[PDB]
Amino acid sequence: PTLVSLLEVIEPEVLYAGYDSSVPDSTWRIMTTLNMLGGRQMIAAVKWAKAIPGFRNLHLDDQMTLLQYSWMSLMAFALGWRSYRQSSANLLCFAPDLIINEQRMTLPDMYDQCKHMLYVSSELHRLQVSYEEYLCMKTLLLLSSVPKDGLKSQELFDEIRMTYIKELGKAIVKREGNSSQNWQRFYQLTKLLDSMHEVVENLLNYCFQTFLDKTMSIEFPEMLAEIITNQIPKYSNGNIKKLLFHQ
Protein backbone atom coordinates (compact mmCIF):
# COMPACT_ATOMS: atom_id res chain seq x y z
CA PRO A 1 0.00 0.00 0.00
CA THR A 2 1.45 3.40 -1.10
CA LEU A 3 1.93 6.22 1.46
CA VAL A 4 -0.45 8.67 -0.31
CA SER A 5 -3.16 5.90 -0.32
CA LEU A 6 -2.79 5.60 3.50
CA LEU A 7 -3.37 9.41 3.77
CA GLU A 8 -6.38 9.09 1.45
CA VAL A 9 -8.26 6.34 3.41
CA ILE A 10 -8.11 8.35 6.69
CA GLU A 11 -9.87 11.42 5.17
CA PRO A 12 -12.46 12.44 7.83
CA GLU A 13 -16.20 12.05 7.15
CA VAL A 14 -18.30 15.14 6.23
CA LEU A 15 -19.95 16.51 9.38
CA TYR A 16 -23.27 18.44 9.39
CA ALA A 17 -23.68 21.72 11.31
CA GLY A 18 -27.24 20.97 12.56
CA TYR A 19 -28.18 24.47 11.32
CA ASP A 20 -31.93 25.28 11.32
CA SER A 21 -32.52 27.13 8.01
CA SER A 22 -36.19 27.95 9.01
CA VAL A 23 -34.90 30.54 11.58
CA PRO A 24 -33.20 33.60 9.91
CA ASP A 25 -29.41 34.09 9.83
CA SER A 26 -27.23 36.31 11.99
CA THR A 27 -23.42 36.45 12.40
CA TRP A 28 -23.66 35.44 16.11
CA ARG A 29 -25.83 32.41 15.22
CA ILE A 30 -23.55 31.31 12.33
CA MET A 31 -20.29 31.87 14.33
CA THR A 32 -21.67 29.94 17.35
CA THR A 33 -22.78 26.96 15.15
CA LEU A 34 -19.43 27.01 13.29
CA ASN A 35 -17.46 27.00 16.59
CA MET A 36 -19.53 24.01 17.86
CA LEU A 37 -18.99 22.26 14.47
CA GLY A 38 -15.25 23.17 14.65
CA GLY A 39 -14.93 21.32 17.98
CA ARG A 40 -16.30 18.16 16.27
CA GLN A 41 -13.90 18.68 13.31
CA MET A 42 -10.97 18.91 15.77
CA ILE A 43 -11.99 15.70 17.61
CA ALA A 44 -12.04 14.02 14.13
CA ALA A 45 -8.60 15.62 13.42
CA VAL A 46 -7.03 13.80 16.39
CA LYS A 47 -8.37 10.41 15.11
CA TRP A 48 -7.04 11.37 11.65
CA ALA A 49 -3.51 12.37 12.88
CA LYS A 50 -3.16 9.13 14.94
CA ALA A 51 -3.58 7.15 11.67
CA ILE A 52 -0.94 9.22 9.74
CA PRO A 53 2.06 6.83 9.31
CA GLY A 54 4.85 7.85 11.75
CA PHE A 55 2.73 10.29 13.85
CA ARG A 56 2.21 7.82 16.77
CA ASN A 57 5.99 7.18 16.85
CA LEU A 58 6.59 10.75 18.08
CA HIS A 59 6.56 11.47 21.84
CA LEU A 60 2.98 11.91 23.16
CA ASP A 61 3.92 15.56 24.10
CA ASP A 62 4.96 16.22 20.40
CA GLN A 63 1.64 14.74 19.19
CA MET A 64 -0.23 17.18 21.47
CA THR A 65 2.11 20.07 20.48
CA LEU A 66 1.61 19.58 16.70
CA LEU A 67 -2.17 19.30 16.86
CA GLN A 68 -2.35 22.40 19.07
CA TYR A 69 -0.17 24.54 16.74
CA SER A 70 -1.67 23.33 13.44
CA TRP A 71 -5.40 23.04 14.35
CA MET A 72 -6.53 26.21 12.41
CA SER A 73 -4.11 25.45 9.54
CA LEU A 74 -5.69 21.96 9.14
CA MET A 75 -9.25 23.37 9.34
CA ALA A 76 -8.69 26.30 6.95
CA PHE A 77 -6.96 23.97 4.46
CA ALA A 78 -9.55 21.14 4.72
CA LEU A 79 -12.33 23.81 4.34
CA GLY A 80 -10.54 25.39 1.32
CA TRP A 81 -10.38 21.98 -0.44
CA ARG A 82 -14.04 21.15 0.42
CA SER A 83 -15.09 24.62 -0.94
CA TYR A 84 -12.88 24.32 -4.09
CA ARG A 85 -14.41 20.88 -4.97
CA GLN A 86 -18.08 21.70 -4.22
CA SER A 87 -18.69 25.25 -5.55
CA SER A 88 -15.94 26.94 -7.74
CA ALA A 89 -17.53 30.29 -6.56
CA ASN A 90 -17.02 32.63 -3.54
CA LEU A 91 -18.62 29.93 -1.33
CA LEU A 92 -17.43 28.32 1.94
CA CYS A 93 -18.75 24.77 2.37
CA PHE A 94 -18.40 24.45 6.16
CA ALA A 95 -21.13 21.74 6.11
CA PRO A 96 -23.81 20.56 3.57
CA ASP A 97 -26.47 22.26 5.78
CA LEU A 98 -24.32 25.38 6.40
CA ILE A 99 -22.82 27.04 3.29
CA ILE A 100 -21.46 30.62 3.53
CA ASN A 101 -22.59 32.28 0.29
CA GLU A 102 -22.56 35.96 -0.88
CA GLN A 103 -25.79 36.86 1.10
CA ARG A 104 -24.32 35.34 4.33
CA MET A 105 -20.96 37.04 3.53
CA THR A 106 -22.67 40.50 3.85
CA LEU A 107 -23.65 39.84 7.52
CA PRO A 108 -21.76 42.10 10.00
CA ASP A 109 -18.11 41.04 10.52
CA MET A 110 -18.75 37.79 8.52
CA TYR A 111 -16.42 38.72 5.60
CA ASP A 112 -13.44 39.93 7.74
CA GLN A 113 -12.99 36.32 8.95
CA CYS A 114 -14.38 34.43 5.91
CA LYS A 115 -12.03 36.23 3.45
CA HIS A 116 -9.00 34.39 4.92
CA MET A 117 -10.79 31.05 4.22
CA LEU A 118 -11.77 32.33 0.69
CA TYR A 119 -8.05 33.05 -0.04
CA VAL A 120 -7.28 29.29 0.58
CA SER A 121 -10.04 27.93 -1.77
CA SER A 122 -9.15 30.67 -4.31
CA GLU A 123 -5.44 29.57 -4.38
CA LEU A 124 -6.28 25.79 -4.67
CA HIS A 125 -8.58 26.70 -7.60
CA ARG A 126 -5.91 29.04 -9.15
CA LEU A 127 -3.14 26.37 -8.81
CA GLN A 128 -5.53 23.47 -9.84
CA VAL A 129 -4.37 21.44 -6.82
CA SER A 130 -4.98 17.68 -7.21
CA TYR A 131 -6.38 15.31 -4.53
CA GLU A 132 -2.97 13.62 -3.98
CA GLU A 133 -1.10 16.97 -3.76
CA TYR A 134 -3.77 18.20 -1.27
CA LEU A 135 -3.41 15.07 0.99
CA CYS A 136 0.40 15.51 1.15
CA MET A 137 0.07 19.27 1.79
CA LYS A 138 -2.49 18.76 4.60
CA THR A 139 -0.23 16.25 6.42
CA LEU A 140 2.61 18.84 5.98
CA LEU A 141 0.43 21.50 7.64
CA LEU A 142 0.24 19.26 10.74
CA LEU A 143 4.08 19.34 10.69
CA SER A 144 4.34 23.12 9.87
CA SER A 145 5.21 24.55 13.35
CA VAL A 146 7.29 23.27 16.28
CA PRO A 147 8.20 24.81 19.70
CA LYS A 148 11.06 27.39 19.84
CA ASP A 149 13.33 24.74 21.50
CA GLY A 150 12.08 21.93 19.22
CA LEU A 151 10.21 18.68 19.82
CA LYS A 152 11.12 15.78 22.17
CA SER A 153 11.41 13.51 19.07
CA GLN A 154 12.89 16.28 16.78
CA GLU A 155 15.19 13.87 14.84
CA LEU A 156 12.30 11.47 14.02
CA PHE A 157 9.99 14.47 13.20
CA ASP A 158 12.56 15.84 10.69
CA GLU A 159 12.67 12.36 9.07
CA ILE A 160 8.81 12.08 8.91
CA ARG A 161 8.46 15.64 7.53
CA MET A 162 11.14 14.89 4.86
CA THR A 163 9.20 11.69 3.91
CA TYR A 164 5.96 13.73 3.39
CA ILE A 165 7.87 16.48 1.44
CA LYS A 166 9.06 13.63 -0.92
CA GLU A 167 5.42 12.43 -1.12
CA LEU A 168 4.35 15.93 -2.30
CA GLY A 169 7.06 15.75 -4.99
CA LYS A 170 5.68 12.33 -6.17
CA ALA A 171 2.10 13.76 -6.39
CA ILE A 172 3.47 16.70 -8.48
CA VAL A 173 5.44 14.38 -10.91
CA LYS A 174 2.09 12.52 -11.63
CA ARG A 175 0.82 15.75 -13.35
CA GLU A 176 3.15 14.45 -16.21
CA GLY A 177 4.94 17.80 -16.71
CA ASN A 178 8.64 18.28 -17.57
CA SER A 179 11.55 18.75 -15.05
CA SER A 180 11.19 22.60 -15.22
CA GLN A 181 7.36 22.55 -14.78
CA ASN A 182 7.72 20.11 -11.83
CA TRP A 183 10.24 22.37 -10.04
CA GLN A 184 7.90 25.38 -10.70
CA ARG A 185 4.89 23.46 -9.24
CA PHE A 186 6.93 22.42 -6.16
CA TYR A 187 7.84 26.11 -5.69
CA GLN A 188 4.14 27.17 -6.10
CA LEU A 189 2.65 24.56 -3.75
CA THR A 190 5.28 25.09 -0.99
CA LYS A 191 4.73 28.88 -1.40
CA LEU A 192 0.99 28.25 -0.67
CA LEU A 193 2.02 26.10 2.38
CA ASP A 194 4.27 28.96 3.59
CA SER A 195 1.36 31.47 3.12
CA MET A 196 -0.87 29.27 5.38
CA HIS A 197 1.12 30.70 8.41
CA GLU A 198 -0.19 34.22 7.52
CA VAL A 199 -3.72 32.96 6.71
CA VAL A 200 -3.81 31.36 10.23
CA GLU A 201 -2.27 34.40 11.96
CA ASN A 202 -5.15 36.56 10.62
CA LEU A 203 -7.76 33.89 11.56
CA LEU A 204 -6.31 33.56 15.11
CA ASN A 205 -6.15 37.32 15.69
CA TYR A 206 -9.95 37.52 15.35
CA CYS A 207 -10.55 34.08 16.92
CA PHE A 208 -8.41 34.84 20.07
CA GLN A 209 -10.18 38.26 20.56
CA THR A 210 -13.68 36.68 20.23
CA PHE A 211 -12.73 33.87 22.69
CA LEU A 212 -11.23 36.31 25.30
CA ASP A 213 -14.03 38.93 25.14
CA LYS A 214 -16.75 37.18 27.18
CA THR A 215 -19.14 40.20 26.60
CA MET A 216 -19.54 39.00 22.92
CA SER A 217 -21.30 35.81 24.23
CA ILE A 218 -19.59 33.74 21.49
CA GLU A 219 -19.33 30.17 22.80
CA PHE A 220 -16.53 27.74 21.97
CA PRO A 221 -16.84 24.00 22.76
CA GLU A 222 -14.38 22.34 25.17
CA MET A 223 -12.11 21.05 22.32
CA LEU A 224 -11.58 24.58 20.91
CA ALA A 225 -11.54 26.41 24.29
CA GLU A 226 -8.76 23.98 25.43
CA ILE A 227 -6.63 24.54 22.25
CA ILE A 228 -7.09 28.38 22.38
CA THR A 229 -6.28 28.44 26.17
CA ASN A 230 -3.06 26.47 25.43
CA GLN A 231 -2.07 28.48 22.33
CA ILE A 232 -2.62 32.08 23.57
CA PRO A 233 0.38 31.94 26.10
CA LYS A 234 2.60 30.16 23.51
CA TYR A 235 2.14 33.06 21.02
CA SER A 236 2.70 35.72 23.75
CA ASN A 237 5.93 33.99 24.97
CA GLY A 238 7.17 33.67 21.35
CA ASN A 239 7.06 29.89 21.85
CA ILE A 240 6.60 28.96 18.14
CA LYS A 241 8.95 28.14 15.27
CA LYS A 242 7.06 28.43 11.96
CA LEU A 243 8.71 26.15 9.41
CA LEU A 244 9.09 27.72 5.93
CA PHE A 245 10.11 26.19 2.60
CA HIS A 246 11.15 29.67 1.22
CA GLN A 247 12.86 32.83 2.57
Partner: peptide, 13 residues
Protein backbone atom coordinates in the same frame (compact mmCIF):
# COMPACT_ATOMS: atom_id res chain seq x y z
CA UNK B 1 -3.72 21.13 31.22
CA UNK B 2 -5.02 19.95 27.75
CA UNK B 3 -7.08 17.13 29.37
CA UNK B 4 -9.41 16.46 26.39
CA UNK B 5 -6.64 16.35 23.81
CA UNK B 6 -4.46 14.00 25.90
CA UNK B 7 -7.54 11.73 26.42
CA UNK B 8 -8.29 11.63 22.66
CA UNK B 9 -4.65 10.78 21.83
CA UNK B 10 -4.42 8.11 24.61
CA UNK B 11 -7.75 6.32 24.26
CA UNK B 12 -8.12 3.46 21.71
CA UNK B 13 -10.06 4.64 18.60
Amino acid sequence: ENALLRYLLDKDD
